[PDB]
Amino acid sequence: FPRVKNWEVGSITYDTLSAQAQQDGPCTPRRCLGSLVFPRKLAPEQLLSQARDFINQYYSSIKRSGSQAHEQRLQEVEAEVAATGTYQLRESELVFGAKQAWRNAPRCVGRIQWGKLQVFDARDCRSAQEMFTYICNHIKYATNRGNLRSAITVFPQRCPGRGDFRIWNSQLVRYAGYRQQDGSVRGDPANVEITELCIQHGWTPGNGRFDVLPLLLQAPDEPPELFLLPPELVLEVPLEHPTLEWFAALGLRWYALPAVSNMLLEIGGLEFPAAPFSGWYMSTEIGTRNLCDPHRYNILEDVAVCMDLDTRTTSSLWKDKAAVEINVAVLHSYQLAKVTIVDHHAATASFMKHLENEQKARGGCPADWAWIVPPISGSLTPVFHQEMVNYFLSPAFRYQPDPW
Amino acid sequence: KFPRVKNWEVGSITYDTLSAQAQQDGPCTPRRCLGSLVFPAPEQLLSQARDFINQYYSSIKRSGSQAHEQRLQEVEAEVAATGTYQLRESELVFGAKQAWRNAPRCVGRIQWGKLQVFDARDCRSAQEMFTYICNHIKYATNRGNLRSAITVFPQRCPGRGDFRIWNSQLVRYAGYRQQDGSVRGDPANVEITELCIQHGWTPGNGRFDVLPLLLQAPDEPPELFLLPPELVLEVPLEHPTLEWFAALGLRWYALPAVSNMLLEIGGLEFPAAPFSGWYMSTEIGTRNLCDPHRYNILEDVAVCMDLDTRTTSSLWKDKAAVEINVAVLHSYQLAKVTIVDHHAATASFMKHLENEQKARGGCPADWAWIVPPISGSLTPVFHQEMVNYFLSPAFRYQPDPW
Ligand code: HEM
Ligand code: HEM
Ligand SMILES: CNCc1cc(C#N)cc(OCc2ccc3ccc(N)nc3c2)c1
Ligand SMILES: CNCc1cc(C#N)cc(OCc2ccc3ccc(N)nc3c2)c1
Ligand SMILES: C[C@H](O)[C@H](O)[C@H]1CNc2nc(N)[nH]c(=O)c2N1
Ligand SMILES: C[C@H](O)[C@H](O)[C@H]1CNc2nc(N)[nH]c(=O)c2N1
Ligand SMILES: [Gd]
Ligand SMILES: [Gd]
Ligand SMILES: [Zn+2]
């Protein structure tokens, strides 16, 4: 059982939860690959085994292991797989399953909220048209006029012997990236292939730097159909700085609802390829990674010129001065627009609170150090001086190949 | 199936073939990663010696020669005879450099080829130890123009105790325990400070009192030595445009000289082998000055900067931090003492990775240590996937002699 020390406080805990780790990770005794983003890849005998452990995990959660309901529910799932080769989750289980996947997510610093999650059940969906309507309800509910509310939306489980539900966009809201004559990119360079795929499937492109893409939605064994998001459903925050008046004139924007839509959800050996979830942004996500990554909006230098910083030399720490005010601008703008946002300090301190909670409840917490530590001011946050143990528990969110 | 490694800012992809030759195991398994943890015979000694001798004779492009083969014979012959063997002067120099080269948590390794190796394997007492250490400090410091060096003392050997330096660095500041639980000076050195006093040292009452050295010769208690004040070069910390900052009375020392690690070469162990380079400014400004368990000046500074300290969203911590780092860099440049910022550091380390991929087919690197403790994703090492593993020769941690 791994020993884990917090070097800021001196405290020691033992991670007994690691012992119950399902799938094997990329690391081996002879090399650590903990920093890789995607490592490696991407029978009723087995499906039943994953179903059973999940069921047990459910009744355990609700004080009812060994009960009448438990025994009955175990026999029910078995009979179903025997007859059909798959089984169906009771709604309550689905809810639990979604919450556990969020809880078990090693890279998510926001898991203090893991218990508070709205779950929309779209397993009865089977057209691409109102797969889109299902998405619109989500975006509407979760945006909630800017008082953001965590939610997930579960579409039908994959069936062998006819195709998957997929959402071709990686987020429900993303900005267009237009390949240029230079080879350069106007807009967001992260979203270039999806901008490409949008045009080829019919979308008439825009002109600017912040054009919200159209959703590419695919129902089983059909080709993806393009829909447009009603502009009044896509809430955006114009970026302004509380003291640097020129900042607004840069015309930067970002959207309110971070909603990841290209990850597969797995519960008890059932696999859900289309299941968009959303919470709310940590300002460092927008202000540092999105706006300041050299391969993203890459604005850093522009902001520095505006601040009249010494960009002649790295040791002015101009990159650092400018990054901070960009982050300041994000938090200020979002607060002014009454949109829920959390700063990297508030966020990391609650995650500490979460580690302590998780200790008492499950004897540890799977946590990926590199993803929990913010991309600015790392050691100024408490999670930096905290030893972490990364491992895989199920239910989970897993990456998947892109449908094309 | 060697590991596939990607740079995510550029799109470069390489395969770390070097990693397959990892000599030892780390803390990780397929079940769980433990990569963020801080602290994770003759046949056996021979096979390491054999591998190191092969390393050396390849670097001097003489692999498979008969100088190469005969060296193996006499190593195996000297292990048979006396249960051990001695490094040639030349091999010692190769081995110390490689150790730096193989150290996964060092961002400064572009410089690995330029390392001054001082051979003190004939040292005989703590007094001589002191003399050797002073000359290191004078050579490495160089009136501000810092130079990389390592002084290698006698290897571990049977029938005789170790040479040990009890301090974790040649230059550290005392931390005096007050009975508020409060600490005057650097709190990370509370332990070394009372050890010193227990071995007959008259303490101070300042926040920056340079500690004496506690040096251990075989089968001998440690012996106290005071560093001549004119040898410990320090830098008063002021800020280019925050004039009140100077009034904090803050300083830091020129020369970062780690002295408690074990240098292992070809199976031989050197428990006392102090090495040094020059500072990366984040070590000083972010970790040593801002860690809550270190000097912890962050809020004092923010309050003087008139920052709003009652809410986290004002990002007071981040601003005050950046300014402490500006003040460090500015003071060191002002005082003409070598120092590197974290953008230049990580930049040159990117080059090192490139050199190393061409040279040995990869490089061990501890991501969580290579990324600066401020402004991570602002630097190029953040977006670079890395493979962490253990090669020999190496610097290893080792227990405190007390
Ligand atoms: C409610 C507020 C939330 C905050 C502030 C938050 C914060 C974050 C952040 C900053 C990341 C790192 C993302 C990146 O750097 O690319 C992350 C990752 C992640 N989040 Fe959360 N999150 C929240 C809610 C949620 C919800 C509602 C879910 C799903 C139910 C979720 C599941 C995940 C998963 C699975 C990852 C890992 C993604 C990956 O491996 O790339 N989080 N979260
Ligand atoms: C010349 C300029 C150098 C720079 C700028 C530099 C930079 C750094 C930094 C910032 C660290 C991490 C420190 C920490 O956070 O604890 C480090 C670690 C390390 N360095 Fe370097 N270094 C330099 C020279 C050297 C030399 C000359 C050697 C040995 C000959 C060396 C060996 C090591 C080792 C073994 C570690 C890991 C320490 C640990 O794991 O606790 N470095 N270096
Ligand atoms: C690997 N980096 C790119 C990336 C790819 C994928 C996929 N597939 C998901 C990703 O998820 C990021 C994420 C996930 C959930 C979040 C919930 C809330 C929030 N504020 N940010 C959140 C950010 C990121
Ligand atoms: C793992 N715990 C922290 C730690 C432990 C030890 C030991 N023993 C040494 C340490 O020193 C780090 C180090 C080593 C060499 C350096 C060379 C130059 C420089 N600027 N910093 C440098 C910093 C740190
Ligand atoms: C190579 C490196 O692992 C990669 O850039 C990671 C580092 N840590 C991260 N952490 C978060 N939260 N998000 C990221 O995209 C990344 N990228
Ligand atoms: C727990 C964690 O590994 C520990 O605090 C590490 C994190 N990364 C680090 N990185 C560097 N360069 N130096 C450090 O001291 C640390 N501390
Ligand atoms: Gd101006
Ligand atoms: Gd001033
Ligand atoms: Zn690992």
Residues A276 and A262 sit within 8 Å (Cβ to Cβ)? no
Cα–Cα distance measured from residue A27 to residue A106, given in angstroms and rounded to the nearest whole number: 15
**Chain A interface, best mutation among B287, B288, B313, B339, by max A CB count within 10 A:** B313
Other Cβ atoms within 10 Å of A340 Cβ, number: 17
Cα–Cα distance measured from residue B314 to residue A284, given in angstroms and rounded to the nearest whole number: 13
Say how many domains are in chain A: 3
- Our CA-based measurement puts residue A231 at a distance from the nearest CA of chain B, in whole angstroms, of 29
Residue A40 shares a structural domain with residue A23: yes
Please tell me what DSSP assigns to residue B283: I
Contacts of B8 in chain A (CB under 8 A): 37, 295
Q: Whose CA is nearest to atom 11 of ligand 2?
A: B106
Taking the CA of A190 as reference, the closest ligand is 3
- B353 CA to middle of ligand 1, Å? 31
Residues B390 and B22 sit within 8 Å (Cβ to Cβ)? yes
Crossing angle of helices B89-102 and B42-59, in 10° steps, is: 90
Residue B242 lies in a domain: yes
What is the full DSSP assignment across B132-200? HHHHHHHHHHGGGS---EEEE----BTTB---EE-SSBSS-B-EEEPTTS-EEE-GGGHHHHHHHHHTT
Residue A380 lies in a domain: no
**Chain A interface, best mutation among B17, B284, B315, by max A CB count within 10 A:** B315
Crossing angle of helices B66-82 and B42-59, in 10° steps, is: 160
Q: Which ligand 3 atom minimizes the distance to the CA of A37?
A: 1
- Our CA-based measurement puts residue A293 at a distance from the nearest CA of chain B, in whole angstroms, of 7
A399 marked as binding residue: yes
CATH of the domain at B39: 3.90.340.10
Hey, what's the torsion of the CAs at B76, B81, B86, B90, to 10 degrees? -50
Q: Report resolution (Å) to 1 decimal.
A: 2.2
Sign, CA dihedral A7-A9-A14-A18, equals negative
- CA A250, A256, A259: angle at the middle one, nearest 5? 125
Residue A320 shares a structural domain with residue A252: yes
Nearest Cα to Cα of residue B216 among B176, B156, B139: B156
Cα–Cα distance measured from residue A241 to residue B272, given in angstroms and rounded to the nearest whole number: 54
- Our CA-based measurement puts residue A107 at a distance from the nearest CA of chain B, in whole angstroms, of 13
Which of A317, A377, A390 shows the shortest C-beta gap to B32? A390
Hey, what's the torsion of the CAs at A211, A212, A214, A219, to 10 degrees? 150
Cα–Cα distance measured from residue B215 to residue A325, given in angstroms and rounded to the nearest whole number: 49
Q: Give long-range contacts, CB 8 A cutoff, 24+ apart: A99-102.
A: A100/A57, A100/A267, A100/A395, A101/A265, A101/A266, A101/A267, A101/A395, A101/A396, A101/A397, A102/A152, A102/A277, A102/A397
Structure tokens at B342: 């974290």
Contacts of A391 in chain B (CB under 8 A): 31-33
Cα–Cα distance measured from residue B82 to residue B104, given in angstroms and rounded to the nearest whole number: 34
- CA B125, B128, B131: angle at the middle one, nearest 5? 155
- CA B199, B201, B206: angle at the middle one, nearest 5? 140
Cα–Cα distance measured from residue B109 to residue A8, given in angstroms and rounded to the nearest whole number: 28
B332 lines ligand 2 (CB under 6 A): no
The HSE-up count of residue A96 (CA atoms within 13 Å, CB side) is: 16
- Which of B37, B92, B94, B105 gets mutated to test ligand 2 (max ligand atoms within 8 A of its CB)? B105
Helix, strand, coil content of chain B in percent (nearest 5): 40, 15, 45
Residue B379 lies in a domain: no
What element of type H or E holds A181? none
Contacts of A377 in chain B (CB under 8 A): 317-318, 321, 374-375
Cβ–Cβ gap A377/B317 under 8 Å? yes
A118-121 and A151-154 as β-strands: parallel, antiparallel, unpaired? parallel
Cα–Cα distance measured from residue B17 to residue A91, given in angstroms and rounded to the nearest whole number: 49
- CA A97, A103, A107: angle at the middle one, nearest 5? 125
- Which of B98, B106, B370, B392 gets mutated to test ligand 2 (max ligand atoms within 8 A of its CB)? B106
Cα–Cα distance measured from residue A380 to residue B290, given in angstroms and rounded to the nearest whole number: 7
Closest residue in A to B292 (Cα–Cα): A8
B100 lines ligand 2 (CB under 6 A): yes
**What length does chain A have?**
404
The HSE-up count of residue A16 (CA atoms within 13 Å, CB side) is: 6
Residue B195 shares a structural domain with residue B222: yes
A178 lines ligand 5 (CB under 6 A): no
Terminal CA-CA length for chain A? 42
Please tell me what DSSP assigns to residue A263: P
Distance of CA A67 to the CA centre of its chain: 36
A125 lines ligand 1 (CB under 6 A): no
B13-15 and B268-270 as β-strands: parallel, antiparallel, unpaired? unpaired
Cα–Cα distance measured from residue A268 to residue A289, given in angstroms and rounded to the nearest whole number: 34
- Our CA-based measurement puts residue A322 at a distance from the nearest CA of chain B, in whole angstroms, of 10
Residue A115 lies in a domain: yes
Contacts of B385 in chain A (CB under 8 A): 35-37
Cβ–Cβ gap B329/A314 under 8 Å? no
Please report, for residues B175, B176, B244, B250, B293, the alpha-carbon distance to residue B182 in angstroms, rounded to integers and kept in the order given.
10, 8, 25, 18, 11
Residue A240 shares a structural domain with residue A312: yes
Please report, for residues A76, A184, A263, A294, B362, the alpha-carbon distance to residue B14 in angstroms, rounded to integers and kept in the order given.
50, 25, 26, 21, 8
| φ, ψ (nearest 5 deg) of residue A282 | -95, 120
Which of A24, A27, A289 shows the shortest C-beta gap to B377? A289
Cα–Cα distance measured from residue B211 to residue B155, given in angstroms and rounded to the nearest whole number: 26
Structure tokens at B19: 């990693």
Other Cβ atoms within 10 Å of A32 Cβ, number: 31
What is the full DSSP assignment across B210-275? BPPEEEE-TTS--EEEPPPTTTS-EEE---SS-GGGGGG--EEES--EE-S-EEEETTEEES---E
- Which of A42, A100, A107 gets mutated to test ligand 1 (max ligand atoms within 8 A of its CB)? A107
Please report, for residues B22, B291, B300, the alpha-carbon distance to residue B245 in angstroms, rounded to integers and kept in the order given.
48, 18, 10
Cα–Cα distance measured from residue B60 to residue B71, given in angstroms and rounded to the nearest whole number: 14
Residue A330 shares a structural domain with residue A367: no
Please report, for residues A29, A37, A110, A268, B368, the alpha-carbon distance to residue A32 in angstroms, rounded to integers and kept in the order given.
7, 13, 25, 29, 12
Cα–Cα distance measured from residue B152 to residue A175, given in angstroms and rounded to the nearest whole number: 58
Cα–Cα distance measured from residue A332 to residue B315, given in angstroms and rounded to the nearest whole number: 11
Distance of CA B288 to the CA centre of its chain: 15
B38 lines ligand 6 (CB under 6 A): yes
Cα–Cα distance measured from residue A32 to residue A38, given in angstroms and rounded to the nearest whole number: 14
- CA B276, B279, B280: angle at the middle one, nearest 5? 135
CATH of the domain at A329: 3.90.1230.10
Residue A32 shares a structural domain with residue A156: yes
Burial class (CB in 10 A: 0-12, 13-18, 19+), B276: buried
Crossing angle of helices A44-61 and A68-84, in 10° steps, is: 160
Q: Is A280 a catalytic residue?
A: yes
Cα–Cα distance measured from residue B105 to residue B365, given in angstroms and rounded to the nearest whole number: 6
Cα–Cα distance measured from residue A17 to residue A365, given in angstroms and rounded to the nearest whole number: 7
Cα–Cα distance measured from residue A294 to residue A252, given in angstroms and rounded to the nearest whole number: 16
Residue A1 lies in a domain: no
Cα–Cα distance measured from residue B82 to residue A170, given in angstroms and rounded to the nearest whole number: 66
Residue recorded with tokens 């083969």: B69
CATH of the domain at A215: 3.90.440.10
B368 marked as binding residue: yes
Cα–Cα distance measured from residue B347 to residue B358, given in angstroms and rounded to the nearest whole number: 18
**CB within 8 A of A60, min separation 6: which ones?**
none
**CB within 8 A of A216, min separation 6: which ones?**
A167, A168, A169, A194, A197, A198, A201, A224, A225, A226
Structure tokens at A151: 């939610």
Catalytic residue numbers of B read 106, 109, 278, 283
SS3 B279: coil
Other Cβ atoms within 10 Å of A344 Cβ, number: 29
Please tell me what DSSP assigns to residue A230: -
Residue A103 shares a structural domain with residue A131: no
Which residues are paired to A212 by β-bridges? A175
**What length does chain B have?**
402
Residues B134 and B126 sit within 8 Å (Cβ to Cβ)? no
- CA A49, A54, A59: angle at the middle one, nearest 5? 130
Residue B222 lies in a domain: yes
**CB within 8 A of B291, min separation 6: which ones?**
A8, A379, A385
Q: Give long-range contacts, CB 8 A cutoff, 24+ apart: A123-128.
A: A123/A94, A123/A154, A123/A155, A123/A156, A123/A157, A124/A156, A125/A155, A125/A156, A125/A165, A126/A156, A126/A219, A126/A220, A127/A219, A128/A217, A128/A218, A128/A219, A128/A222, A128/A224, A128/A225
B346 touches chain A (CB under 8 A): no
Closest residue in B to A314 (Cα–Cα): B343
Structure tokens at A66: 């060994």
Cα–Cα distance measured from residue A387 to residue A14, given in angstroms and rounded to the nearest whole number: 11
| φ, ψ (nearest 5 deg) of residue B90 | -60, -45
B395 lines ligand 2 (CB under 6 A): yes
Nearest Cα to Cα of residue B168 among B286, B287, B261: B261
**CB within 8 A of B314, min separation 6: which ones?**
A328, B307, B308
Residue A113 shares a structural domain with residue A200: no
Q: Whose CA is nearest to atom 26 of ligand 1?
A: A279
Which of B30, B38, B387 shows the shortest C-beta gap to A24? B30
Residue A384 lies in a domain: no
Structure tokens at B27: 């803390």
Cα–Cα distance measured from residue A359 to residue A352, given in angstroms and rounded to the nearest whole number: 11
Cβ–Cβ gap A324/B344 under 8 Å? no
Experimental approach: X-ray
Contacts of A2 in chain B (CB under 8 A): 32, 34
Nearest Cα to Cα of residue B186 among B164, B165, B204, B166: B204
Which residues are paired to B396 by β-bridges? B262
Choice among A102, A114, A280, A318 that is catalytic: A280
Interface A:B, Cβ pairs < 8 A: 201
- E strands, B43-129, are 116-119
Residues A346 and B318 sit within 8 Å (Cβ to Cβ)? no
What is the full DSSP assignment across A110-162? TGGGTT--EEEE-TT---SHHHHHHHHHHHHHHHGGGS---EEEEPPPPBTTB
SS3 B316: helix
Burial class (CB in 10 A: 0-12, 13-18, 19+), B82: exposed
Structure tokens at A358: 């998780």
Cα–Cα distance measured from residue A130 to residue A63, given in angstroms and rounded to the nearest whole number: 38
Cβ–Cβ gap B318/A376 under 8 Å? yes
The domain of B250 spans 234-256+279-344
Residue A230 shares a structural domain with residue A294: no
Residue A130 shares a structural domain with residue A201: yes
Q: Is A404 a catalytic residue?
A: no
Residue B11 lies in a domain: no
Residue A362 shares a structural domain with residue A331: no
Residue A30 shares a structural domain with residue A155: yes
